[PDB]
Amino acid sequence: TIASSRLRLLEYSAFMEVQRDPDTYSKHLFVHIGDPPLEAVDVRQIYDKFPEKKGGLKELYEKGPPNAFFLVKFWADLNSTIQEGPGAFYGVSSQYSSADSMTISVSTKVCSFGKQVVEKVETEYARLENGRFVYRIHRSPMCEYMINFIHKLKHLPEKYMMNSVLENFTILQVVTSRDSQETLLVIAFVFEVSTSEHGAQHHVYKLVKD
Ligand SMILES: CCCCCCCCCCCCCC(=O)NO
Ligand SMILES: [Cl-]
Ligand SMILES: [Cl-]
């Protein structure tokens, strides 16, 4: 599980969905997240995979707190398991929870060669649920940048070529209290392609400075 002192990620899910007919929908998951301790990774080995001026990962980690910084490696499933109808939905669903009511800002920077090409910013409002606070982003539609990228990768003949492109592709998710701008949760994403028919896999690491 991925949790700072202040906020916990419960679910993250990137997917495409197709309407075979008005009453029938196929949904394919690219990546999914749904309590062990975590192996550590030096944060200084990923500075080069994210923007590094002001608002950069180095200055974020230095601002603290350190209990907030994770790395997820995703084995993304890019199999055509659902028949490719044109005009399909490409979406991202995620849930967070906290003990305290707060208004959170969720920054999702898509990076190529350690440079921002897309930032998505969504403000989410606490909902009281079973004595805790929950934040739902439900079927947040993907940008054209990401849907094209997913098209480019699937039209490659060999998985090793996909993994070659993916080496230079990273996403940084930063969750802040809208008001205080206090860092609640930071998750660096790195990607390879899935080969096993077990499907999409993921590994979680703690980011440390040493
Ligand atoms: C890399 C191929 C598998 C797709 C993984 C995508 C995971 C997260 C979806 C992209 C987040 C950016 C949100 C967006 O599309 N626009 O802001
Ligand atoms: Cl997102
Ligand atoms: Cl309730």
Side-chain angles (χ1 to χ4, degrees):
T1 77
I2 297 159
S4 61
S5 42
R6 299 214 67 199
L7 190 67
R8 162 178 285 94
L9 172 85
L10 302 176
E11 179 224 340
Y12 193 98
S13 171
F15 59 88
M16 73 175 298
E17 201 185 50
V18 164
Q19 181 187 310
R20 295 294 167 82
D21 57 72
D23 291 349
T24 307
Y25 292 82
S26 286
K27 186 175 163 181
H28 171 75
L29 295 181
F30 300 120
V31 296
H32 50 67
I33 299 176
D35 42 324
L38 301 176
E39 283 149 326
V41 160
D42 189 9
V43 72
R44 287 169 335 207
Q45 274 158 345
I46 50 158
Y47 287 172
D48 75 300
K49 295 195 196 290
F50 296 107
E52 288 305 331
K53 272 179 163 154
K54 271 149 198 150
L57 182 53
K58 182 184 173 181
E59 284 192 359
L60 262 171
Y61 195 93
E62 273 159 351
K63 186 200 206 286
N67 57 49
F69 288 77
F70 303 83
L71 167 62
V72 177
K73 197 264 188 67
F74 275 131
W75 287 267
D77 183 340
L78 300 167
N79 310 346
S80 297
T81 49
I82 81 174
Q83 293 164 49
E84 304 283 309
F89 186 69
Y90 289 81
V92 182
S93 292
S94 63
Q95 292 183 66
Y96 315 80
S97 71
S98 56
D100 304 345
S101 174
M102 43 198 318
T103 312
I104 71 175
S105 192
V106 181
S107 157
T108 304
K109 316 205 190 190
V110 173
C111 303
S112 206
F113 296 91
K115 275 203 185 191
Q116 169 172 339
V117 295
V118 183
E119 174 169 42
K120 195 195 219 146
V121 178
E122 300 189 79
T123 291
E124 217 53 61
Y125 286 92
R127 203 197 152 251
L128 175 65
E129 209 198 79
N130 300 312
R132 303 256 302 166
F133 295 91
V134 306
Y135 315 78
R136 289 185 175 90
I137 299 157
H138 193 246
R139 304 175 57 85
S140 189
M142 281 195 202
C143 52
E144 191 61 29
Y145 185 93
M146 282 302 320
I147 299 167
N148 282 349
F149 184 65
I150 290 169
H151 282 156
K152 279 203 187 142
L153 290 170
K154 284 180 83 167
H155 292 151
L156 294 178
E158 298 294 297
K159 301 219 143 157
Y160 75 85
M161 308 183 93
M162 304 193 197
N163 272 355
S164 199
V165 185
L166 281 174
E167 272 180 290
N168 308 294
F169 179 75
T170 69
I171 295 168
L172 189 68
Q173 181 173 122
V174 175
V175 177
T176 56
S177 167
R178 182 192 58 186
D179 296 299
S180 66
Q181 294 216 211
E182 187 168 322
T183 303
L184 299 180
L185 192 70
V186 175
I187 307 174
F189 300 89
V190 301
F191 295 84
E192 278 186 309
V193 161
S194 188
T195 62
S196 74
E197 72 172 34
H198 275 108
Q201 302 293 333
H202 70 278
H203 200 91
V204 186
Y205 299 111
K206 191 73 192 74
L207 290 161
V208 297
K209 223 206 200 201
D210 303 321

Coordinates of all heavy atoms in Angstrom, one line a residue, residues 69-139:
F69 N 7.1 10.0 -0.5 CA 7.7 9.8 -1.8 C 7.9 8.3 -2.1 O 8.5 7.6 -1.3 CB 9.1 10.5 -1.8 CG 9.0 12.0 -1.9 CD1 8.7 12.7 -0.8 CD2 9.1 12.7 -3.1 CE1 8.5 14.1 -0.8 CE2 9.0 14.1 -3.2 CZ 8.7 14.8 -2.0
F70 N 7.2 7.9 -3.2 CA 7.2 6.4 -3.6 C 7.6 6.4 -5.1 O 7.5 7.4 -5.8 CB 5.9 5.8 -3.4 CG 5.4 5.9 -1.9 CD1 4.8 7.0 -1.4 CD2 5.6 4.8 -1.1 CE1 4.4 7.1 -0.1 CE2 5.3 4.9 0.3 CZ 4.7 6.0 0.8
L71 N 8.2 5.2 -5.5 CA 8.4 4.9 -6.9 C 7.5 3.6 -7.2 O 7.6 2.7 -6.4 CB 9.8 4.6 -7.2 CG 10.2 4.0 -8.5 CD1 9.8 4.8 -9.7 CD2 11.7 3.7 -8.6
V72 N 6.7 3.7 -8.2 CA 5.9 2.5 -8.8 C 6.5 2.2 -10.1 O 6.5 3.1 -11.0 CB 4.4 2.7 -8.9 CG1 3.7 1.6 -9.5 CG2 3.8 3.1 -7.5
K73 N 7.0 0.9 -10.3 CA 7.3 0.4 -11.7 C 6.1 -0.4 -12.1 O 5.6 -1.3 -11.4 CB 8.5 -0.5 -11.6 CG 9.2 -0.8 -13.0 CD 8.7 -2.1 -13.6 CE 9.5 -2.5 -14.8 NZ 10.9 -2.8 -14.5
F74 N 5.5 0.0 -13.3 CA 4.4 -0.7 -13.9 C 4.8 -1.5 -15.1 O 5.6 -1.0 -16.0 CB 3.3 0.4 -14.4 CG 2.3 0.9 -13.4 CD1 2.1 2.2 -13.2 CD2 1.6 0.0 -12.7 CE1 1.2 2.7 -12.3 CE2 0.7 0.4 -11.7 CZ 0.4 1.8 -11.6
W75 N 4.4 -2.8 -15.2 CA 4.4 -3.6 -16.4 C 3.0 -3.4 -17.0 O 2.1 -4.1 -16.6 CB 4.7 -5.1 -16.1 CG 6.1 -5.4 -15.7 CD1 7.1 -5.8 -16.6 CD2 6.7 -5.3 -14.4 NE1 8.3 -5.9 -15.9 CE2 8.1 -5.7 -14.6 CE3 6.2 -5.0 -13.1 CZ2 8.9 -5.7 -13.5 CZ3 7.1 -5.0 -12.1 CH2 8.4 -5.4 -12.2
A76 N 2.9 -2.4 -18.0 CA 1.7 -2.0 -18.6 C 1.3 -3.1 -19.6 O 2.1 -3.6 -20.4 CB 1.9 -0.7 -19.3
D77 N 0.0 -3.5 -19.5 CA -0.6 -4.5 -20.5 C -1.1 -3.7 -21.7 O -2.0 -2.9 -21.6 CB -1.8 -5.2 -19.8 CG -2.4 -6.3 -20.7 OD1 -2.2 -6.2 -21.9 OD2 -3.1 -7.2 -20.1
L78 N -0.5 -4.0 -22.9 CA -0.8 -3.4 -24.2 C -1.3 -4.4 -25.2 O -1.2 -4.2 -26.4 CB 0.5 -2.7 -24.7 CG 1.0 -1.6 -23.8 CD1 2.4 -1.2 -24.2 CD2 0.1 -0.4 -23.7
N79 N -1.8 -5.5 -24.7 CA -2.5 -6.6 -25.5 C -3.8 -6.1 -26.0 O -4.5 -5.3 -25.3 CB -2.7 -7.9 -24.7 CG -1.4 -8.4 -24.0 OD1 -0.3 -7.9 -24.3 ND2 -1.6 -9.3 -23.1
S80 N -4.2 -6.5 -27.2 CA -5.6 -6.2 -27.8 C -6.6 -7.2 -27.4 O -7.0 -8.0 -28.2 CB -5.5 -6.0 -29.3 OG -4.6 -4.9 -29.7
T81 N -6.9 -7.3 -26.1 CA -7.8 -8.3 -25.4 C -9.2 -8.0 -25.7 O -10.1 -8.9 -25.5 CB -7.5 -8.4 -23.9 OG1 -7.4 -7.1 -23.4 CG2 -6.2 -9.2 -23.7
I82 N -9.5 -6.7 -26.0 CA -10.9 -6.2 -26.4 C -10.8 -5.7 -27.9 O -9.8 -4.9 -28.2 CB -11.5 -5.2 -25.4 CG1 -10.9 -3.8 -25.6 CG2 -11.2 -5.6 -24.0 CD1 -11.5 -2.7 -24.8
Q83 N -11.7 -6.1 -28.7 CA -11.7 -5.7 -30.2 C -11.8 -4.2 -30.4 O -12.6 -3.6 -29.7 CB -12.9 -6.5 -30.8 CG -12.8 -8.0 -30.9 CD -14.0 -8.7 -31.2 OE1 -14.8 -8.4 -32.1 NE2 -14.4 -9.7 -30.3
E84 N -10.9 -3.7 -31.2 CA -10.6 -2.3 -31.3 C -11.6 -1.5 -32.1 O -11.4 -1.4 -33.4 CB -9.2 -2.0 -31.9 CG -8.0 -2.8 -31.2 CD -7.6 -2.1 -29.9 OE1 -7.3 -0.9 -29.9 OE2 -7.5 -2.8 -28.9
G85 N -12.7 -1.1 -31.5 CA -13.7 -0.2 -32.1 C -13.2 1.2 -32.0 O -12.6 1.6 -31.1
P86 N -13.4 2.0 -33.1 CA -13.0 3.4 -33.1 C -13.9 4.2 -32.2 O -15.0 3.8 -32.0 CB -13.1 3.9 -34.6 CG -14.1 2.9 -35.1 CD -13.9 1.6 -34.4
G87 N -13.4 5.3 -31.6 CA -14.1 6.2 -30.7 C -14.4 5.6 -29.4 O -15.5 5.8 -28.8
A88 N -13.4 4.8 -28.9 CA -13.5 4.1 -27.5 C -13.0 5.1 -26.4 O -12.4 6.1 -26.8 CB -12.5 2.9 -27.6
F89 N -13.4 4.9 -25.2 CA -13.1 5.7 -24.0 C -11.7 5.3 -23.4 O -11.6 4.1 -23.0 CB -14.2 5.7 -22.9 CG -13.9 6.6 -21.8 CD1 -14.0 8.0 -22.0 CD2 -13.6 6.2 -20.5 CE1 -13.8 8.9 -21.0 CE2 -13.3 7.1 -19.5 CZ -13.5 8.4 -19.7
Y90 N -10.8 6.3 -23.3 CA -9.5 6.1 -22.6 C -9.5 7.0 -21.3 O -9.7 8.2 -21.4 CB -8.3 6.5 -23.5 CG -8.0 5.6 -24.6 CD1 -8.8 5.6 -25.8 CD2 -7.0 4.7 -24.6 CE1 -8.5 4.8 -26.9 CE2 -6.8 3.8 -25.6 CZ -7.5 3.8 -26.7 OH -7.3 3.0 -27.8
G91 N -9.4 6.3 -20.2 CA -9.7 6.9 -18.9 C -8.8 6.5 -17.7 O -8.1 5.4 -17.9
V92 N -8.8 7.2 -16.6 CA -8.0 7.0 -15.4 C -8.9 7.2 -14.2 O -9.5 8.3 -14.0 CB -6.8 8.0 -15.4 CG1 -6.0 7.7 -14.1 CG2 -6.0 7.9 -16.6
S93 N -9.1 6.2 -13.4 CA -9.8 6.2 -12.1 C -8.8 6.1 -10.9 O -8.0 5.2 -11.0 CB -10.9 5.1 -12.1 OG -11.9 5.4 -13.0
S94 N -9.0 6.9 -9.9 CA -8.1 6.7 -8.7 C -8.9 7.2 -7.4 O -9.8 8.0 -7.6 CB -6.8 7.5 -8.8 OG -7.0 8.9 -8.9
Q95 N -8.6 6.7 -6.3 CA -9.2 7.0 -5.0 C -8.0 7.2 -4.0 O -7.0 6.4 -4.0 CB -10.0 5.8 -4.5 CG -11.3 5.6 -5.3 CD -12.1 4.5 -4.7 OE1 -12.7 4.6 -3.6 NE2 -12.3 3.4 -5.5
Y96 N -8.2 8.2 -3.1 CA -7.3 8.5 -1.9 C -8.2 8.5 -0.7 O -9.4 8.6 -0.8 CB -6.5 9.7 -2.1 CG -5.9 9.9 -3.5 CD1 -6.7 10.3 -4.6 CD2 -4.6 9.5 -3.8 CE1 -6.2 10.4 -5.9 CE2 -4.0 9.6 -5.0 CZ -4.8 10.1 -6.1 OH -4.3 10.2 -7.4
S97 N -7.6 8.3 0.5 CA -8.2 8.5 1.8 C -7.3 9.2 2.8 O -6.1 9.0 2.7 CB -8.8 7.2 2.3 OG -7.7 6.4 2.7
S98 N -7.9 9.9 3.7 CA -7.1 10.6 4.9 C -8.1 10.6 6.1 O -9.3 10.4 5.9 CB -6.7 12.0 4.5 OG -7.8 12.8 4.1
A99 N -7.5 10.7 7.3 CA -8.2 10.8 8.6 C -8.8 12.2 8.7 O -9.8 12.4 9.4 CB -7.2 10.5 9.7
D100 N -8.1 13.2 8.1 CA -8.5 14.7 8.2 C -9.2 15.1 6.9 O -8.9 14.6 5.8 CB -7.3 15.5 8.3 CG -6.4 15.2 9.5 OD1 -6.9 14.4 10.4 OD2 -5.2 15.6 9.6
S101 N -10.2 15.9 7.0 CA -10.9 16.6 5.9 C -10.0 17.7 5.4 O -9.5 18.6 6.2 CB -12.2 17.2 6.3 OG -12.8 18.0 5.2
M102 N -9.7 17.7 4.1 CA -8.9 18.7 3.4 C -9.3 18.7 1.9 O -9.9 17.7 1.5 CB -7.4 18.5 3.5 CG -7.0 17.0 3.4 SD -5.3 16.7 4.0 CE -4.4 18.1 3.5
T103 N -9.0 19.8 1.2 CA -9.1 19.9 -0.3 C -7.8 19.6 -0.9 O -6.8 20.4 -0.6 CB -9.7 21.3 -0.7 OG1 -10.9 21.5 0.2 CG2 -10.1 21.3 -2.1
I104 N -7.7 18.6 -1.8 CA -6.4 18.1 -2.3 C -6.3 18.6 -3.8 O -7.4 18.6 -4.5 CB -6.3 16.6 -2.2 CG1 -7.2 15.8 -3.1 CG2 -6.4 16.2 -0.7 CD1 -7.1 14.3 -3.0
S105 N -5.1 18.9 -4.3 CA -4.8 19.2 -5.7 C -3.9 18.0 -6.2 O -2.9 17.7 -5.5 CB -4.1 20.5 -6.0 OG -4.1 20.8 -7.3
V106 N -4.3 17.4 -7.3 CA -3.7 16.1 -7.8 C -3.0 16.5 -9.2 O -3.7 16.6 -10.2 CB -4.7 15.0 -8.0 CG1 -4.0 13.7 -8.6 CG2 -5.4 14.7 -6.8
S107 N -1.7 16.8 -9.1 CA -0.9 17.1 -10.3 C -0.4 15.8 -10.9 O 0.3 15.1 -10.2 CB 0.2 18.1 -10.0 OG 1.3 18.0 -11.0
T108 N -0.6 15.6 -12.2 CA -0.1 14.4 -13.0 C 0.7 14.9 -14.2 O 0.1 15.3 -15.2 CB -1.3 13.5 -13.5 OG1 -2.0 13.1 -12.3 CG2 -0.9 12.3 -14.2
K109 N 2.0 15.0 -14.1 CA 2.9 15.4 -15.2 C 3.3 14.2 -16.0 O 4.1 13.3 -15.4 CB 4.2 16.1 -14.6 CG 4.0 17.1 -13.6 CD 5.0 18.2 -13.5 CE 4.9 19.1 -12.3 NZ 5.8 20.2 -12.3
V110 N 2.9 14.1 -17.2 CA 3.5 13.2 -18.2 C 4.8 13.8 -18.7 O 4.8 14.9 -19.2 CB 2.6 12.9 -19.4 CG1 3.3 12.1 -20.5 CG2 1.3 12.2 -19.0
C111 N 5.9 13.0 -18.6 CA 7.3 13.5 -19.0 C 7.9 12.6 -20.1 O 7.6 11.4 -20.1 CB 8.2 13.5 -17.8 SG 7.6 14.6 -16.5
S112 N 8.6 13.2 -21.1 CA 9.4 12.5 -22.1 C 10.8 13.0 -22.0 O 11.0 14.3 -22.1 CB 8.8 12.6 -23.5 OG 9.2 11.5 -24.3
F113 N 11.8 12.2 -21.9 CA 13.2 12.5 -21.7 C 13.4 13.5 -20.6 O 14.2 14.5 -20.7 CB 13.8 13.0 -23.1 CG 13.8 12.0 -24.2 CD1 12.7 11.9 -25.0 CD2 14.8 11.1 -24.3 CE1 12.6 10.9 -26.0 CE2 14.8 10.2 -25.4 CZ 13.7 10.1 -26.2
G114 N 12.7 13.3 -19.5 CA 12.8 14.1 -18.3 C 12.2 15.5 -18.4 O 12.6 16.4 -17.6
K115 N 11.4 15.7 -19.4 CA 10.7 17.1 -19.8 C 9.2 16.9 -19.8 O 8.7 15.9 -20.4 CB 11.2 17.6 -21.1 CG 12.6 18.4 -21.0 CD 12.7 19.3 -22.2 CE 14.1 20.0 -22.2 NZ 14.1 21.1 -23.2
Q116 N 8.5 17.8 -19.2 CA 7.0 17.9 -19.1 C 6.5 18.1 -20.5 O 6.9 19.1 -21.2 CB 6.6 19.0 -18.2 CG 5.1 19.4 -18.2 CD 4.7 20.3 -17.2 OE1 5.3 20.5 -16.2 NE2 3.5 21.0 -17.4
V117 N 5.6 17.2 -21.0 CA 4.8 17.5 -22.2 C 3.3 17.7 -21.9 O 2.6 18.4 -22.6 CB 4.9 16.3 -23.2 CG1 6.3 16.2 -23.8 CG2 4.4 15.0 -22.6
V118 N 2.8 17.2 -20.7 CA 1.4 17.3 -20.2 C 1.4 17.4 -18.7 O 2.0 16.5 -18.1 CB 0.5 16.2 -20.7 CG1 -0.9 16.4 -20.3 CG2 0.6 15.9 -22.2
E119 N 0.8 18.4 -18.1 CA 0.3 18.4 -16.7 C -1.2 18.4 -16.7 O -1.8 19.3 -17.3 CB 0.9 19.6 -16.0 CG 0.3 19.7 -14.5 CD 1.0 20.7 -13.6 OE1 1.3 21.8 -14.1 OE2 1.3 20.3 -12.5
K120 N -1.8 17.4 -16.0 CA -3.3 17.5 -15.7 C -3.4 17.8 -14.2 O -2.7 17.2 -13.4 CB -3.9 16.1 -15.9 CG -5.4 16.1 -16.0 CD -6.0 14.7 -15.9 CE -7.2 14.5 -16.8 NZ -7.3 13.1 -17.3
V121 N -4.2 18.8 -13.9 CA -4.5 19.3 -12.5 C -6.0 19.1 -12.2 O -6.8 19.8 -12.9 CB -4.0 20.7 -12.2 CG1 -4.3 21.1 -10.8 CG2 -2.6 20.8 -12.5
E122 N -6.3 18.3 -11.2 CA -7.7 18.1 -10.7 C -7.8 18.4 -9.2 O -6.9 17.9 -8.4 CB -8.2 16.7 -11.0 CG -8.2 16.3 -12.5 CD -8.8 15.0 -12.8 OE1 -10.1 15.0 -12.9 OE2 -8.1 14.1 -13.1
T123 N -8.7 19.3 -8.8 CA -9.0 19.6 -7.3 C -10.0 18.6 -6.9 O -11.0 18.4 -7.6 CB -9.4 21.0 -7.1 OG1 -8.3 21.8 -7.4 CG2 -10.0 21.3 -5.8
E124 N -9.8 17.9 -5.7 CA -10.8 17.0 -5.2 C -11.2 17.4 -3.8 O -10.3 17.8 -3.0 CB -10.3 15.5 -5.3 CG -11.4 14.5 -5.6 CD -12.2 14.9 -6.8 OE1 -11.6 14.9 -7.9 OE2 -13.4 15.1 -6.7
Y125 N -12.5 17.2 -3.4 CA -13.1 17.6 -2.1 C -13.4 16.4 -1.3 O -14.1 15.5 -1.8 CB -14.4 18.5 -2.4 CG -14.1 19.8 -2.9 CD1 -14.0 20.1 -4.3 CD2 -13.9 20.9 -2.1 CE1 -13.7 21.4 -4.8 CE2 -13.6 22.2 -2.5 CZ -13.5 22.4 -3.9 OH -13.3 23.7 -4.4
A126 N -13.0 16.4 0.0 CA -13.1 15.4 1.0 C -14.6 15.0 1.0 O -15.5 15.9 1.0 CB -12.6 15.8 2.3
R127 N -14.9 13.7 1.1 CA -16.2 13.1 1.4 C -16.1 12.2 2.6 O -15.2 11.3 2.6 CB -16.7 12.3 0.1 CG -18.2 12.1 0.1 CD -18.7 11.1 -0.9 NE -20.0 10.5 -0.4 CZ -20.2 9.3 0.1 NH1 -19.2 8.4 0.2 NH2 -21.4 9.0 0.5
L128 N -16.9 12.5 3.7 CA -16.9 11.7 4.9 C -17.5 10.3 4.6 O -18.6 10.2 3.9 CB -17.8 12.4 6.0 CG -18.0 11.6 7.2 CD1 -16.7 11.4 8.0 CD2 -19.1 12.3 8.1
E129 N -16.8 9.2 4.9 CA -17.2 7.8 4.6 C -16.6 6.9 5.6 O -15.3 6.6 5.6 CB -16.8 7.5 3.2 CG -17.7 6.5 2.5 CD -17.1 5.9 1.3 OE1 -16.2 5.0 1.5 OE2 -17.4 6.3 0.2
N130 N -17.4 6.4 6.5 CA -17.0 5.4 7.6 C -16.0 6.0 8.5 O -15.0 5.3 8.8 CB -16.7 4.0 6.9 CG -17.8 3.5 6.0 OD1 -19.0 3.5 6.5 ND2 -17.6 3.1 4.8
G131 N -16.2 7.3 8.8 CA -15.4 8.0 9.8 C -14.0 8.4 9.3 O -13.2 9.0 10.1
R132 N -13.8 8.2 8.0 CA -12.5 8.7 7.2 C -13.0 9.6 6.1 O -14.2 9.8 5.9 CB -11.8 7.5 6.7 CG -11.4 6.4 7.7 CD -9.9 6.5 8.0 NE -9.1 6.3 6.8 CZ -7.7 6.6 6.8 NH1 -7.1 7.0 7.9 NH2 -7.1 6.4 5.7
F133 N -12.0 10.2 5.4 CA -12.3 11.1 4.3 C -11.7 10.4 3.0 O -10.6 9.9 3.0 CB -11.8 12.5 4.5 CG -12.5 13.2 5.7 CD1 -12.1 13.0 7.0 CD2 -13.7 13.8 5.4 CE1 -12.8 13.6 8.0 CE2 -14.5 14.4 6.5 CZ -14.0 14.2 7.8
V134 N -12.5 10.4 1.9 CA -12.2 9.8 0.6 C -12.3 10.8 -0.5 O -13.1 11.8 -0.4 CB -13.1 8.5 0.3 CG1 -13.0 7.5 1.5 CG2 -14.5 8.9 0.0
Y135 N -11.4 10.6 -1.5 CA -11.3 11.5 -2.7 C -11.4 10.5 -3.9 O -10.5 9.7 -4.0 CB -10.1 12.3 -2.6 CG -9.8 12.9 -1.3 CD1 -9.2 12.2 -0.3 CD2 -10.0 14.3 -1.1 CE1 -9.0 12.8 1.0 CE2 -9.7 14.9 0.1 CZ -9.2 14.1 1.2 OH -8.9 14.7 2.4
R136 N -12.5 10.7 -4.7 CA -12.7 9.9 -6.0 C -12.4 10.7 -7.2 O -13.1 11.8 -7.3 CB -14.1 9.2 -6.0 CG -14.2 8.1 -5.0 CD -15.6 7.4 -5.1 NE -15.6 6.3 -4.2 CZ -16.0 6.3 -2.9 NH1 -16.5 7.4 -2.4 NH2 -16.0 5.2 -2.2
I137 N -11.5 10.3 -8.0 CA -11.4 10.8 -9.5 C -11.9 9.6 -10.3 O -11.2 8.5 -10.3 CB -10.0 11.2 -9.8 CG1 -9.5 12.4 -9.0 CG2 -9.9 11.5 -11.3 CD1 -8.0 12.5 -8.9
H138 N -13.1 9.7 -10.9 CA -13.8 8.6 -11.6 C -13.8 8.9 -13.1 O -14.2 10.0 -13.5 CB -15.3 8.5 -11.1 CG -15.9 7.3 -11.5 ND1 -17.0 7.2 -12.4 CD2 -15.7 6.0 -11.2 CE1 -17.4 6.0 -12.6 NE2 -16.6 5.2 -11.9
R139 N -13.3 7.9 -13.9 CA -13.2 7.9 -15.4 C -12.8 9.3 -15.8 O -13.5 10.0 -16.6 CB -14.6 7.6 -15.9 CG -15.1 6.2 -15.5 CD -16.6 6.0 -16.0 NE -16.7 6.0 -17.4 CZ -16.4 5.0 -18.3 NH1 -16.0 3.9 -17.8 NH2 -16.5 5.2 -19.6

